Design an enzyme around this catalytic site. Structure first.
Site, PDB file in Angstrom:
ATOM      1  N   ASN A  56       0.776  -1.210  -0.171  1.00 21.21           N
ATOM      2  CA  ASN A  56      -0.031  -0.186  -0.084  1.00 21.21           C
ATOM      3  C   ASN A  56       1.015   1.127  -0.012  1.00 21.21           C
ATOM      4  O   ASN A  56       2.261   1.121  -0.136  1.00 21.21           O
ATOM      5  CB  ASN A  56      -0.930  -0.081   1.389  1.00 21.21           C
ATOM      6  CG  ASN A  56      -0.572   0.168   2.576  1.00 21.21           C
ATOM      7  OD1 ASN A  56      -1.484   0.323   3.683  1.00 21.21           O
ATOM      8  ND2 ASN A  56       0.793   0.493   3.035  1.00 21.21           N
ATOM      9  N   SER A 337      11.485  -0.319   2.872  1.00 23.67           N
ATOM     10  CA  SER A 337       9.846  -0.642   3.082  1.00 23.67           C
ATOM     11  C   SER A 337       8.872   0.127   2.028  1.00 23.67           C
ATOM     12  O   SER A 337       7.754  -0.010   2.194  1.00 23.67           O
ATOM     13  CB  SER A 337       9.617  -0.316   4.539  1.00 23.67           C
ATOM     14  OG  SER A 337       9.754   0.952   4.892  1.00 23.67           O
ATOM     15  N   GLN A 341       5.431   2.158  -3.216  1.00 27.81           N
ATOM     16  CA  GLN A 341       5.026   3.467  -3.194  1.00 27.81           C
ATOM     17  C   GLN A 341       5.813   4.485  -3.701  1.00 27.81           C
ATOM     18  O   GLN A 341       5.471   5.524  -3.781  1.00 27.81           O
ATOM     19  CB  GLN A 341       4.537   3.823  -1.689  1.00 27.81           C
ATOM     20  CG  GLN A 341       5.710   4.015  -0.850  1.00 27.81           C
ATOM     21  CD  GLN A 341       5.456   3.796   0.853  1.00 27.81           C
ATOM     22  OE1 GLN A 341       4.444   3.094   0.904  1.00 27.81           O
ATOM     23  NE2 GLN A 341       5.928   4.739   1.634  1.00 27.81           N
TER      24      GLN A 341
END
Ligand SMILES: Cc1cc2nc3c(=O)[nH]c(=O)nc-3n(C[C@H](O)[C@H](O)[C@H](O)COP(=O)(O)OP(=O)(O)OC[C@H]3O[C@@H](n4cnc5c(N)ncnc54)[C@H](O)[C@@H]3O)c2cc1C
Ligand SMILES: Cc1cc2nc3c(=O)[nH]c(=O)nc-3n(C[C@H](O)[C@H](O)[C@H](O)COP(=O)(O)OP(=O)(O)OC[C@H]3O[C@@H](n4cnc5c(N)ncnc54)[C@H](O)[C@@H]3O)c2cc1C
Ligand SMILES: Nc1ccccc1C(=O)O
Ligand SMILES: Nc1ccccc1C(=O)O
Ligand SMILES: Nc1ccccc1C(=O)O
Ligand SMILES: Nc1ccccc1C(=O)O
EC number: 1.4.3.3
Lengths: 363, 363
Positions: A56, A337, A341
């Site tokens: 996400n 991480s 995105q």
């Protein structure tokens, strides 16, 4: 006597970053060949990070700490928006994000990007935690990569499975290579980056119609997240083991992840019990991070490599002429991480460097 | 209406141990299908151990500490002897082995097995070290595995690429599975063995006509070895990182390995200099070890699995009937640094368990 292209580029790496770089370069007219150990069809391979993401859009830095990161995230958000109509991206409405303190909310920098951004009442947060809610976007990490791969096929890019140990092996009929190798950047002669480090992430893939995304960083001793993805599946996670390479499943970590996650939202259970949670798969990925942050920059390099350029150079320590060409190496790795995105913005910066380099050197 | 075999076996794992188990079972008449993530053609895959071995025969325990180990080593030696005529094994004559003390020489248990076994004078040992010389045998680890694979083909065994997360996925049309999964035994539901641990080994593959094998354990703070293999190649090694999963090449370790190895035998250099050593490849493998020693035993198991059998069982914690068959699981893993040299004896013990089990259960 056929007119041939002078816009050849090798993309080394086939994770979301090499793939997105490759796609923008191909749309720009470059002839692109992808060379990589791990390909989008390898959806359970643990030797790259891209199959294992949520994925996400969850910003992790302040504008001040991560100016490029925010630029890249903002750009990728617009792209994902464009993918919702065809289903290659999915709204996660009423996402909830819990942190320890106001600091953990990063200055709210992205509030104009994620719709309906607003603070949560303390009645809707874990005890002692603060929170916001907003609508964000998610993609199905391995399927998104295969999608990019199909787009590449149509634009005429090709793929080849290869494991490189030295740069000249990648400068395969091209004078520009895009290095999107994640952790592999440390052990390839000619790159040798000791700063590359893994950050271990264990997760539980759960069968559940839960459609809400919840994230809780308010407990340092137990990171927890629930990330829905297309197909009636949610990913429950919780680890961040910096410098940890362990690829085996920690059974104790399973229980800590499911308990915390259950806490966060019992509807991931068939009956709000740990025992009602329908486990599909236990997963471990290593996020490809880098001390000093992601590396997106073009470097000029002379080939062939000598042992004074690289401790890992092949052949004897003694090296000389035997030719000596100069090529461009455009780095794109250590996204930790946030590779999905930041991926489209990163690729935009990558293709600008390539355009640049071709204008200067390769013609 | 065709007579069909009732001697079906799945071998889970395609490293030297699953391969050798599979081959003996097939020669015994079993119908064998191999299921594995990593196959003998994957010669640079770091997610199994078998491509990375020397591989020579170097006993590491006393008879008292490792009775099975010695039995298995002794048996594999005779087999390798039989392979010299066709080149699938190679004599390493005048091997030299240096240890810290008499203890390090393990009671000389194998002196009747390796020809010309005798003590070295202190004039021929590093300072303070003691030593023996003998002739031992070596195989080319990845080619030896492909050789076993060809033998399997001819006996009608088949191979299929698969990554298993739970035992029932391996009990694929068979009631007996051979579990030769190395480190994977820890994270497969139904096995869950927490005792499985890696032991990291970094090496340098060197182009050199050096034909002598030297091994030196006299320096705890720097294990060193030179292991020749067919093709004018030698492997120079030095690490034993217990519990270490790091797959990246340590550049400092490169230098310590080459210096020590040079010390041991300058003829691995083009000119007896570190800089004269012709480096082919830098390698990192993880030896699949197990606290408590290798596991070679047959276990009876009921399927399907419930969360009380395995913390990693799929589906909901709550499980019941929905059938319930019973099958045999023959373990063969955790061979650590001695999988090749124990492999044929281990496979012999494995096939005896299978014969046994079929006599008892499966008919
Ligand atoms: C549990 C979990 C949670 C996460 N969730 C999210 C999330 O929600 N959102 C978000 O944005 N990201 C997430 N991340 C991080 C995202 O997974 C990584 O940032 C992104 O996958 C990295 O992409 P990459 O292309 O840089 O590297 P890696 O995927 O995917 O690719 C390295 C590529 O380089 C090739 N390679 C390097 N070594 C070599 C060589 N020597 N020779 C040939 N090729 C080689 C590899 O085979 C592979 O092709 C998650 C990760 C994890 C483990
Ligand atoms: C540097 C170095 C030096 C060494 N030198 C020697 C030497 O000289 N002599 C000697 O005897 N040995 C040596 N060893 C140890 C020898 O390499 C290992 O003991 C032997 O390879 C282990 O064989 P294995 O078949 O048990 O396991 P691993 O090779 O080779 O095989 C595990 C098999 O299980 C499959 N696996 C497990 N997980 C799963 C799952 N979940 N689903 C599907 N399949 C899966 C894997 O993909 C692979 O097919 C060396 C090793 C190292 C790193
Ligand atoms: N920055 C993160 C991203 C994802 C999961 C955990 C973390 C963490 O700091 O713990
Ligand atoms: N990148 C993330 C975004 C949200 C939750 C978890 C992660 C993670 O890496 O674990
Ligand atoms: N038992 C071993 C086998 C190979 C290399 C090192 C060791 C060691 O103890 O250091
Ligand atoms: N198994 C071995 C035998 C001899 C030298 C090294 C090793 C090793 O594992 O590193």
């Amino acid at each position: 006597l056929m007119m041939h292209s002078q816009k050849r580029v090798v993309v080394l790496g086939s994770g979301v970053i090499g793939l997105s770089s490759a796609l923008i370069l191909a749309r720009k007219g470059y002839s692109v060949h992808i060379l990589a150990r791990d390909l989008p069809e390898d959806v359970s391979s643990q030797t790259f990070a891209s199959p294992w993401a949520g994925a996400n859009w969850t910003p992790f830095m302040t504008l001040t700490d991560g100016p490029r990161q925010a630029k890249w995230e903002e750009s990728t958000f617009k792209k994902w928006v464009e993918l919702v109509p065809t289903g290659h991206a999915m709204w996660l409405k009423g996402t909830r994000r819990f942190a320890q303190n106001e600091d953990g909310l990063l200055g709210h920098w992205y509030k104009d990007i994620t719709p309906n951004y607003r603070p949560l009442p303390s009645s809707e947060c874990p005890p002692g935690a603060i929170g916001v809610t907003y609508d964000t976007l998610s993609v199905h990490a391995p399927k998104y990569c295969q999608y990019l791969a199909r787009e590449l096929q149509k634009l005429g890019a090709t793929f080849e499975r290869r494991t490189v140990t030295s740069l000249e092996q990648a400068f395969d009929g091209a004078d520009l290579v895009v290095n999107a190798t994640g952790l592999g950047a440390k052990s390839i002669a000619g790159i040798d980056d000791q700063a590359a480090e893994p950050i271990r992430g264990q997760t539980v893939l759960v069968k559940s119609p839960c459609k809400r995304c919840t994230m809780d960083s308010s407990d340092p001793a137990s990171p927890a997240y629930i990330i829905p993805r297309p197909g009636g599946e949610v990913i429950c996670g919780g680890t961040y083991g910096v410098g940890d390479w362990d690829l085996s499943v920690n059974p104790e970590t399973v229980q800590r992840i499911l308990k915390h996650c259950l806490r966060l939202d019992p509807t991931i259970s068939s009956d709000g019990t740990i025992e009602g949670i329908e486990v599909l798969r236990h997963n471990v990925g290593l996020r490809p991070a880098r001390r000093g942050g992601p590396r997106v920059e073009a470097e000029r390099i002379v080939l062939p490599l000598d042992r004074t350029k690289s401790p890992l150079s092949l052949g004897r320590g003694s090296a000389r002429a035997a030719k000596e060409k100069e090529v461009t190496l455009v780095h794109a790795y250590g996204f930790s991480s946030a590779g999905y995105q930041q991926s489209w913005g990163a690729a935009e910066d990558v293709a600008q460097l390539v355009d640049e380099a071709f204008q200067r050197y390769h013609g």
